[PDB]
Design a protein around this ligand. Structure first.
Ligand SMILES: O=c1cc(Br)ccn1CCO
Ligand SMILES: [Cl-]
Length: 130
């Protein structure tokens, strides 16, 4: 329906604003663009599902997220990809892990404070009805 289309539009506007706030944070610069396979050729061979905030914007705009839960799965991937690809004790890996975890924690905290649970529930019920 048109009302359901209006619901999903509001979801996209909400998710674009959360994603923009993550992207303008200087801590999260490394997560804003896909990993250039020059600097790191083995990335795309180790990480089967690369994810970055530019890919998340593209996905929002392609109407791939019908619920905040589906968006949070892609935020979770940014964090788990970094935990998997950068697991060493050395400071370069520890810094990327801490930034990735912080991204994830930030996205969850903004959604806890700003997502209405009844809005999420509506999205979930329209999705489950398709
Ligand atoms: O990129 C921008 C910049 C501003 Br300012 C606001 C929204 N967005 C969309 C998120 O990609
Ligand atoms: Cl840095």
């Amino acid at each position: 329906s048109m009302q359901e289309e209006d619901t999903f539009r509001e979801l996209r506007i909400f998710l674009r604003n959360v994603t923009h706030r993550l992207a303008i944070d200087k801590r999260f610069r490394v997560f804003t663009k896909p990993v250039d396979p020059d600097e790191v050729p083995d990335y795309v061979t180790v990480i089967k599902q690369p994810m970055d905030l530019s890919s998340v914007i593209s996905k929002i705009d392609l109407h791939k997220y019908l619920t905040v839960k589906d968006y949070l799965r892609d935020i979770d991937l940014i964090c788990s990809n970094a935990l998997e690809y950068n697991p060493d004790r050395d400071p370069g890996d520890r810094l990327i892990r801490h930034r990735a975890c912080a991204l994830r924690d930030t996205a969850y905290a903004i959604i806890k404070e700003e997502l209405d649970e009844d809005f999420e529930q509506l999205c979930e019920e329209i999705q489950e009805s398709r």
